[PDB]
């Protein structure tokens, strides 16, 4: 089946494999070195020796061996997957030394040889780690302050899009600046990007729960979008921090009436309420559909079912959005 020297290299390969199962790195190297000389046109002996050097932490030697194996496999037309494995291991030495940029370079070569699932996942980990390292390196609170300040100069002139651009650079430079998130939120509210005002206000608020302005900016966007029920709740959270606050009190009072005055046509109610996944779930759930039918037909079904919070709050949500009216 094999040339005698190939078979001899194989017997040594197998003995080397057993030596590695037992973590006998050095006996195994002896077996693979014999196997390598017996059958030199075969990457497997070289990559196995590299496996030792990788496990030992001797990454420079294992890299030289992987590179030699790659050159040999190409000369001798060995499977592309074998070449890929040697590259994957090279990327692994860099991964282990935390040189993720190099791990990626070599994993990219590995993928070209074969897009091995293991490489795809390991290189993704290398990217995630390197990307976080890069953001942390990017962060610099003083540059964030300079961009923030230019954003403020623009903002204050009514140039909200430019302010937003500078605020974006400032946040890349300082991610915990709660005030900065709310300044962007303001740009969006003024530009009618009310949805974006909400997302930046929410991060501002979680970072600084007492920043009453984060709440008034969010609530204003909600009120503007006729989401008076949440706008009132957000303005109220602002009132919980400071009951004398003007937007928190005034926006709250406008929402208090407007949330009912806007119902108008049921089409407005359906389009707005069904935008909310919570009521979509209530309506998509057949148990609720059955409960609702009983409720329409019998006010006592309501009297009894609403004593249990699992139903009472599904109903309360449908009432809050205006889908269920009670007379």
């Amino acid at each position: 089946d094999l040339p005698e020297n190939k078979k001899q290299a194989l017997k040594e390969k197998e003995l080397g494999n057993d030596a590695y199962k037992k973590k006998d790195f050095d006996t195994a190297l002896k077996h693979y070195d014999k196997a390598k000389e017996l059958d030199p046109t075969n990457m497997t002996y070289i990559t196995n020796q590299a496996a030792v050097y990788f496990e030992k932490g001797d990454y420079n030697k294992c890299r030289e061996l992987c590179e030699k194996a790659i050159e040999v496999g190409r000369e001798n037309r060995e499977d592309y997957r074998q070449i890929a494995k040697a590259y994957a291991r090279i990327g692994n030495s860099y991964f282990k030394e935390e040189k993720y940029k190099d791990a990626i370079h070599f994993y990219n070569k590995s993928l070209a040889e074969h897009r091995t699932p293991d490489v795809l996942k390991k290189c993704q980990q290398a990217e995630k780690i390197l990307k976080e390292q890069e953001r942390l390196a990017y962060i610099n609170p003083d540059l964030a302050l300079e961009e923030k300040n230019k954003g403020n100069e623009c903002f204050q002139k009514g140039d909200y899009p430019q302010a937003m651009k500078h605020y974006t650079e400032a946040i890349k430079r300082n991610p915990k600046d709660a005030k900065l998130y709310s300044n962007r939120a303001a740009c969006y509210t003024k530009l009618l990007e009310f949805q974006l005002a909400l997302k930046d206000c929410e991060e501002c608020i979680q970072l600084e729960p007492t920043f009453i302005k984060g709440y008034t900016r969010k609530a204003a966007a909600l009120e503007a979008m006729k989401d008076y029920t949440k706008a009132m709740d957000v303005y109220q959270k602002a009132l919980d921090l400071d009951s004398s606050c003007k937007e928190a009190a005034d926006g709250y009072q406008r929402c208090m009436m407007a949330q009912y005055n806007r119902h108008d046509s049921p089409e407005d109610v359906k389009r707005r309420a069904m935008a909310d996944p919570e009521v979509q779930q209530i309506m998509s759930d057949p148990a609720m559909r059955l409960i609702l039918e009983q409720m329409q037909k019998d006010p006592q079904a309501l009297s009894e079912h609403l004593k249990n919070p699992v139903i009472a709050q599904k109903i309360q949500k449908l009432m809050d959005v205006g889908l269920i009216a009670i007379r």
């Binding site: 954003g151 005030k179 709310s182 300044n183 003024k190 302005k213 900016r217 204003a220 937007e247």
Partner: peptide
């Protein structure tokens, strides 16, 4: 209003 101010 708050949305015309910076912090």
């Amino acid at each position: 209003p708050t949305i015309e101010e910076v912090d």
